[PDB]
Scaffold this motif. Structure first.
Motif, PDB file in Angstrom:
ATOM      1  N   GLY A  30       0.739  -1.460  -0.144  1.00  0.00           N
ATOM      2  CA  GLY A  30       0.006  -0.048  -0.026  1.00  0.00           C
ATOM      3  C   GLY A  30       0.769   1.198   0.071  1.00  0.00           C
ATOM      4  N   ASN A  31       2.204   1.207   0.619  1.00  0.00           N
ATOM      5  CA  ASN A  31       2.756   2.496   0.715  1.00  0.00           C
ATOM      6  C   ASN A  31       3.384   2.848  -0.714  1.00  0.00           C
ATOM      7  OD1 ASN A  31       3.627   3.228   3.505  1.00  0.00           O
ATOM      8  ND2 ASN A  31       3.770   1.039   3.595  1.00  0.00           N
ATOM      9  N   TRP A  32       3.682   1.706  -1.555  1.00  0.00           N
ATOM     10  CA  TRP A  32       4.312   2.138  -3.275  1.00  0.00           C
ATOM     11  C   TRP A  32       2.989   2.355  -3.936  1.00  0.00           C
ATOM     12  CZ3 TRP A  32       9.452   2.040  -3.461  1.00  0.00           C
ATOM     13  CH2 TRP A  32      10.011   1.234  -2.571  1.00  0.00           C
ATOM     14  N   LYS A  73       0.494   7.387  -6.698  1.00  0.00           N
ATOM     15  CA  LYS A  73      -0.940   7.962  -6.967  1.00  0.00           C
ATOM     16  C   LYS A  73      -0.349   9.359  -6.875  1.00  0.00           C
ATOM     17  CE  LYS A  73      -4.977   9.194  -7.038  1.00  0.00           C
ATOM     18  NZ  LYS A  73      -5.862   9.300  -8.413  1.00  0.00           N
ATOM     19  N   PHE A  74       0.163   9.702  -5.799  1.00  0.00           N
ATOM     20  CA  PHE A  74       0.473  11.205  -5.596  1.00  0.00           C
ATOM     21  C   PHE A  74       1.424  11.514  -6.281  1.00  0.00           C
ATOM     22  CE2 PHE A  74      -2.050  10.222  -1.780  1.00  0.00           C
ATOM     23  CZ  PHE A  74      -3.265  10.928  -2.123  1.00  0.00           C
ATOM     24  N   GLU A  75       2.448  10.974  -6.758  1.00  0.00           N
ATOM     25  CA  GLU A  75       3.641  11.495  -7.483  1.00  0.00           C
ATOM     26  C   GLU A  75       3.414  11.429  -9.049  1.00  0.00           C
ATOM     27  OE1 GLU A  75       6.348  12.232  -6.824  1.00  0.00           O
ATOM     28  OE2 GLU A  75       6.807  11.685  -4.485  1.00  0.00           O
ATOM     29  N   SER A  76       2.554  10.500  -9.354  1.00  0.00           N
ATOM     30  CA  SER A  76       2.387  10.659 -10.944  1.00  0.00           C
ATOM     31  C   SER A  76       0.935  10.196 -11.380  1.00  0.00           C
ATOM     32  CB  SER A  76       2.943   9.349 -11.637  1.00  0.00           C
ATOM     33  OG  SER A  76       2.574   7.951 -11.318  1.00  0.00           O
ATOM     34  N   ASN A  77      -0.022  10.127 -10.403  1.00  0.00           N
ATOM     35  CA  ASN A  77      -1.515   9.613 -10.679  1.00  0.00           C
ATOM     36  C   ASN A  77      -1.488   8.573 -11.728  1.00  0.00           C
ATOM     37  OD1 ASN A  77      -4.042  10.420 -10.423  1.00  0.00           O
ATOM     38  ND2 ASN A  77      -4.566  11.605 -12.228  1.00  0.00           N
ATOM     39  N   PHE A  78      -0.555   7.623 -11.510  1.00  0.00           N
ATOM     40  CA  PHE A  78      -0.371   6.154 -12.023  1.00  0.00           C
ATOM     41  C   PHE A  78      -0.164   6.296 -13.404  1.00  0.00           C
ATOM     42  CE2 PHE A  78      -3.857   4.817  -8.788  1.00  0.00           C
ATOM     43  CZ  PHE A  78      -3.016   4.538  -7.738  1.00  0.00           C
ATOM     44  N   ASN A  79       0.417   7.321 -13.895  1.00  0.00           N
ATOM     45  CA  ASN A  79       0.772   7.861 -15.249  1.00  0.00           C
ATOM     46  C   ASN A  79       2.428   7.269 -15.530  1.00  0.00           C
ATOM     47  OD1 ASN A  79       1.052   8.442 -18.004  1.00  0.00           O
ATOM     48  ND2 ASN A  79       0.300  10.470 -17.578  1.00  0.00           N
ATOM     49  N   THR A  80       2.503   6.566 -16.447  1.00  0.00           N
ATOM     50  CA  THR A  80       4.064   6.118 -16.359  1.00  0.00           C
ATOM     51  C   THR A  80       4.749   7.276 -17.224  1.00  0.00           C
ATOM     52  OG1 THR A  80       3.738   4.881 -18.659  1.00  0.00           O
ATOM     53  CG2 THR A  80       3.671   3.639 -16.489  1.00  0.00           C
ATOM     54  N   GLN A  81       4.011   8.075 -18.385  1.00  0.00           N
ATOM     55  CA  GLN A  81       4.517   9.148 -19.061  1.00  0.00           C
ATOM     56  C   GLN A  81       4.873  10.465 -17.990  1.00  0.00           C
ATOM     57  OE1 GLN A  81       3.650   9.052 -23.235  1.00  0.00           O
ATOM     58  NE2 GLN A  81       1.791   7.952 -22.749  1.00  0.00           N
ATOM     59  N   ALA A  82       4.713  10.623 -16.984  1.00  0.00           N
ATOM     60  CA  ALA A  82       4.567  11.929 -16.169  1.00  0.00           C
ATOM     61  C   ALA A  82       5.976  12.190 -16.030  1.00  0.00           C
ATOM     62  CB  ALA A  82       3.986  11.517 -14.877  1.00  0.00           C
ATOM     63  N   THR A  83       6.196  13.709 -16.379  1.00  0.00           N
ATOM     64  CA  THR A  83       7.520  14.379 -16.188  1.00  0.00           C
ATOM     65  C   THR A  83       7.279  15.567 -15.535  1.00  0.00           C
ATOM     66  OG1 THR A  83       7.409  15.228 -18.502  1.00  0.00           O
ATOM     67  CG2 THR A  83       8.614  13.277 -18.049  1.00  0.00           C
ATOM     68  N   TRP A 104      10.954  10.242  -1.110  1.00  0.00           N
ATOM     69  CA  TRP A 104       9.727  10.720  -2.004  1.00  0.00           C
ATOM     70  C   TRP A 104       9.115  11.783  -1.204  1.00  0.00           C
ATOM     71  CZ3 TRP A 104      11.358   5.537  -2.650  1.00  0.00           C
ATOM     72  CH2 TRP A 104      11.587   5.060  -3.851  1.00  0.00           C
ATOM     73  N   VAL A 105       8.960  12.876  -1.453  1.00  0.00           N
ATOM     74  CA  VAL A 105       8.283  13.913  -0.644  1.00  0.00           C
ATOM     75  C   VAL A 105       6.718  13.604  -0.676  1.00  0.00           C
ATOM     76  CG1 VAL A 105       7.944  16.381  -0.450  1.00  0.00           C
ATOM     77  CG2 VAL A 105      10.375  15.618  -1.381  1.00  0.00           C
ATOM     78  N   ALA A 106       6.061  13.224  -1.686  1.00  0.00           N
ATOM     79  CA  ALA A 106       4.722  12.925  -1.638  1.00  0.00           C
ATOM     80  C   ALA A 106       4.242  11.887  -0.535  1.00  0.00           C
ATOM     81  CB  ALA A 106       4.276  12.825  -3.033  1.00  0.00           C
ATOM     82  N   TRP A 107       5.101  10.967  -0.501  1.00  0.00           N
ATOM     83  CA  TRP A 107       4.925   9.792   0.176  1.00  0.00           C
ATOM     84  C   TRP A 107       5.063  10.387   1.700  1.00  0.00           C
ATOM     85  CZ3 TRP A 107       7.828   7.624   4.268  1.00  0.00           C
ATOM     86  CH2 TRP A 107       7.089   6.450   5.043  1.00  0.00           C
ATOM     87  N   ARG A 108       6.085  11.114   1.807  1.00  0.00           N
ATOM     88  CA  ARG A 108       6.228  11.635   3.446  1.00  0.00           C
ATOM     89  C   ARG A 108       5.024  12.335   3.751  1.00  0.00           C
ATOM     90  NH1 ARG A 108       8.971  15.706   3.305  1.00  0.00           N
ATOM     91  NH2 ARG A 108       8.509  16.839   5.197  1.00  0.00           N
ATOM     92  N   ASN A 109       4.605  13.323   2.816  1.00  0.00           N
ATOM     93  CA  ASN A 109       3.445  14.249   3.178  1.00  0.00           C
ATOM     94  C   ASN A 109       2.177  13.898   3.137  1.00  0.00           C
ATOM     95  OD1 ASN A 109       5.489  16.121   3.863  1.00  0.00           O
ATOM     96  ND2 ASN A 109       5.449  17.059   1.703  1.00  0.00           N
ATOM     97  N   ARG A 110       1.877  12.845   2.130  1.00  0.00           N
ATOM     98  CA  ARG A 110       0.427  12.285   1.946  1.00  0.00           C
ATOM     99  C   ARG A 110       0.298  10.792   2.278  1.00  0.00           C
ATOM    100  NH1 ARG A 110      -1.028  15.233  -3.538  1.00  0.00           N
ATOM    101  NH2 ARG A 110      -3.264  15.019  -2.677  1.00  0.00           N
ATOM    102  N   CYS A 111       1.188  10.151   2.546  1.00  0.00           N
ATOM    103  CA  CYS A 111       1.014   8.700   2.577  1.00  0.00           C
ATOM    104  C   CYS A 111       1.421   8.108   4.138  1.00  0.00           C
ATOM    105  CB  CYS A 111       1.735   7.722   1.557  1.00  0.00           C
ATOM    106  SG  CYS A 111       1.292   8.246  -0.080  1.00  0.00           S
ATOM    107  N   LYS A 112       2.703   8.586   4.549  1.00  0.00           N
ATOM    108  CA  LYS A 112       3.357   8.327   5.884  1.00  0.00           C
ATOM    109  C   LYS A 112       2.387   8.507   6.977  1.00  0.00           C
ATOM    110  CE  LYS A 112       7.887   8.994   8.242  1.00  0.00           C
ATOM    111  NZ  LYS A 112       9.031   9.951   8.595  1.00  0.00           N
TER     112      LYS A 112
END
Ligand SMILES: [Cl-]
Ligand SMILES: [Cl-]
Ligand code: NA
Ligand code: NA
Length: 129
Positions: free
Chosen positions: A26-28, A33-43, A108-116
């Motif tokens: 679930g962490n991954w 989700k919050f890094e890329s919205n599940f989109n492999t092409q995100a930059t 991963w900043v979004a993990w720290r701020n929105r998942c942790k």
């Protein structure tokens, strides 16, 4: 490719991320989700001139080579474009190196701020795994 929630969970599990270095699946999924919205092409471009690539937004200053980040390391020894593939293998293998470097998933900043500290198990609830 834009993944579904359970589709990505299954793919990450097959690639050995469930409980990798003690981080449940679930962490991954939450981080993706919050890094890329599940989109492999995100930059996304950073202020220092580096760029983040792919479903887990891996940064070109340390982990991959994009030909335009002066003084960067390529610690995963890959071109950054390989991180945008519909096949997540290269992103997963590089993430394993990142999470093992000492700081865990705090890299991963979004993990720290929105998942942790949240109920990350909800991100795999209902999936056939
Ligand atoms: Cl979980
Ligand atoms: Cl954030
Ligand atoms: Na799905
Ligand atoms: Na680099």
């Amino acid at each position: 490719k834009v993944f579904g929630r359970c589709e990505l969970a299954a793919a990450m599990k097959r690639h050995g991320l469930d409980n990798y270095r003690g981080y449940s699946l679930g962490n991954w999924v939450c981080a993706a989700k919050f890094e890329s919205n599940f989109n492999t092409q995100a930059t996304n471009r950073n202020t220092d001139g580096s760029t983040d690539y792919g479903i887990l937004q891996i940064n070109s200053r340390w982990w991959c080579n994009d030909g335009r980040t002066p003084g960067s390391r390529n610690l995963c020894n890959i071109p950054c474009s390989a991180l945008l593939s519909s096949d997540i293998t290269a992103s997963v293998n590089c993430a394993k190196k990142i999470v093992s470097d000492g700081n865990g998933m705090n890299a991963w900043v979004a993990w720290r701020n929105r998942c942790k500290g949240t109920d990350v198990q909800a991100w795999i609830r209902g999936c056939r795994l």
